[PDB]
């Protein structure tokens, strides 16, 4: 099932096809259509990005703190689950969520959705653990926030689609571009953007990836961005979504994790490689 | 019913009487007898402690790291859950559990127990946070480990009895001594012990506690140790059990958490005042 993807629109397995949650198998046996108005991956269709209009990044969550404001972002998996980075956890006094807004100032002051629990991967490697044990800092940089009450969906608030490991591996990451967004700062060490910014960044090959980094790029991450073109994610963007489009449908593929500066020559942004954490996600989500 | 505990062996609810998990109330409505052979608390009956004989610290758990071996201890609550300190979590690459063993060497070389989930208290304050938001370091130093597979209990391996906030506040914590153990260092900055050590440590008055150190213990902690007698817990003992005896049964009352050095003059060990976290524990054990 590597030649045309078995002709499946989404997921294939030898062949038999299937779709992401909230999609129905076409009358042909290969197609996938949205079986509801709140199906995942449906859209209105950071350094040097464009404003993500309302409803253009519905899966974009906002982690908010009284003193710090919006320190990170996330991605809506379902009504009561939100994916983010583990290193966004326990770095501020409080923490709550906000979805459906693209205006930074409005998010902060506005009301806030409460957080119930929070799952952090057990093998997450915080900078300190890295130096002491010589491990790759920010390895397994994945986490999931469970809301206390279900999130209300709309055409501006809907979850991103979760891919199959195989699918995300053979099709998604073999695509040309991916979308990244966040309320992070617009310039290395620069100011936080007042708006939700969005950006397209190309998958970079493993080798080019590792060789251009001062620190190890483990099998659980992947890099994206441009060699010299000054576009990239930045601080505050952590936890933010990295999705790939495939047939008018967005799937989650990465998580803003780490980087050496922001948009530097010959260097890229690092991302958690979800194709390695599908079972980890599925376990939690199904409970 | 704070009048001698209603003449009841375990828990007294105002009078109504009961017992710890795995115990049975007598016909007199006061006594508590062991329901089974693996009933909690039941026994064979660190600076300058003694070698805890096998079967004398049956609830003692050993937290094991690939490259660093035993770095902390824990306390068995049930076949599935082991109690420990939060600061023992995510401070090492891997974390496995080993029980029914008192030899440090054999534990590191032998077969380990796999850890499934780990519940770290949401309000725990690491040195990191305590400097940033002026909070009390090691406040809420508590965490629960959930094994992949049920632990096999035996003479050498059994859990400590979880008490009620009241019982622990009105009876246990009014006792003269507690018992504590671990595989930690035998002396400040010194080498870790070769074998499990066990120590009796007297309960200290919260006042003599605030007066002794630059670092005040929060209301979620309590201190225990000696003024000038070189007996205390030490690094590597964290997570270990602080148990209090009542009617030949062992109740968990504290957790080895912190302290200024080990066995210093006019200073005592700090322990997670477990009676503050009983409902917290009960929720997760459901």
């Amino acid at each position: 099932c590597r030649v045309d993807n078995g002709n499946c629109w989404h997921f294939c397995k030898h062949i038999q096809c299937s779709c992401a949650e909230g999609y129905l198998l076409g009358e042909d046996g290969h197609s996938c259509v949205a079986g509801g108005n709140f199906s995942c991956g449906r859209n209105i269709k950071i350094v040097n990005g464009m404003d993500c209009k309302l409803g253009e990044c519905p899966w974009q969550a906002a982690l908010v703190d009284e003193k710090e404001g919006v320190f990170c972002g996330g991605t809506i998996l379902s009504p009561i689950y939100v994916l983010t980075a583990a290193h966004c956890i326990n770095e501020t006094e409080t923490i709550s969520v906000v979805v459906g807004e693209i205006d930074k100032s409005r998010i902060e002051t506005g009301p806030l959705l409460s957080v119930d629990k929070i799952y952090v991967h057990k093998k997450f490697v915080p900078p300190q653990k890295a130096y002491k044990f010589d491990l790759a800092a920010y390895d397994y940089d994945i986490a999931i926030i469970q809301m206390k009450t279900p999130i209300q969906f709309s055409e501006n608030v809907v979850p991103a689609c979760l891919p199959t490991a195989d699918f995300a591996n053979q099709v998604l990451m073999k695509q040309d571009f991916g979308i990244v967004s966040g309320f992070g700062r617009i310039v290395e060490k620069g100011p936080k953007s007042k708006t939700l910014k969005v950006l397209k960044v190309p998958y970079v090959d493993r080798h080019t990836c590792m060789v251009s980094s001062e620190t190890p790029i483990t099998p659980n991450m992947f890099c994206a961005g441009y060699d010299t073109l000054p576009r990239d994610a930045c601080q505050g963007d952590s936890g933010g979504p990295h999705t790939t489009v495939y047939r008018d449908t967005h799937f989650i593929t990465g998580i803003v994790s780490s980087g050496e500066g922001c948009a530097r020559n010959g260097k890229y942004g690092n991302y958690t490689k979800l194709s390695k954490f599908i079972p980890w996600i599925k376990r939690i989500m199904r409970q | 019913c704070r009048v001698d505990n209603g003449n009841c062996w375990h828990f007294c609810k105002h009078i109504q009487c009961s017992c710890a998990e795995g115990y049975l109330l007598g016909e007199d409505g006061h006594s508590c007898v062991a329901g089974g052979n693996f009933s909690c608390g039941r026994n064979i009956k660190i600076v300058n402690g003694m070698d805890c004989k096998l079967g004398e610290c049956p609830w003692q758990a050993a937290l094991v790291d690939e490259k660093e071996g035993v770095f902390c201890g824990g306390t068995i609550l049930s076949p599935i859950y082991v109690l420990t300190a939060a600061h023992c979590i995510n401070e090492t690459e891997t974390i496995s559990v080993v029980v029914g063993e008192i030899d440090k060497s054999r534990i590191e070389t032998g077969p380990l127990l796999s850890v499934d989930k780990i519940y770290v208290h949401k309000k725990f304050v690491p040195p990191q946070k305590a400097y940033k938001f002026d909070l009390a370091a090691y406040d809420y130093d508590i965490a629960i480990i959930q094994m992949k597979t049920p632990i096999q209990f035996s003479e050498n391996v059994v859990p400590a009895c979880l008490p009620t906030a009241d019982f622990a506040n009105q009876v246990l914590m009014k006792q003269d001594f507690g018992i504590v153990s671990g595989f930690g260092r035998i002396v400040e900055k010194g080498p870790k012990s070769k074998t499990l050590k066990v120590l009796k440590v007297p309960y200290v008055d919260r006042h003599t506690c605030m007066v002794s150190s630059e670092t005040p213990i929060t209301p979620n902690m309590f201190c225990a140790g000696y003024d000038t007698l070189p007996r205390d817990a030490c690094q590597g003992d964290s997570g270990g059990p602080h148990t209090t005896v009542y009617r030949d049964t062992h109740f968990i009352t504290g957790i080895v958490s912190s302290g200024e050095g080990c066995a210093r003059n006019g200073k005592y060990g700090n322990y997670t005042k477990l009676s503050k976290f009983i409902p917290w524990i009960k929720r997760i054990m459901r």
Binding site: I89, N90, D116, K117, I118, Y119, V120, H121, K122, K148, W280, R283, I284 | I89, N90, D116, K117, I118, Y119, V120, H121, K122, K123, I144, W280, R283, I284
Partner: peptide, 8 residues
């Protein structure tokens, strides 16, 4: 609320 962070 279990007032906890779970590590899976």
């Amino acid at each position: 609320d279990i007032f906890a962070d779970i590590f899976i």
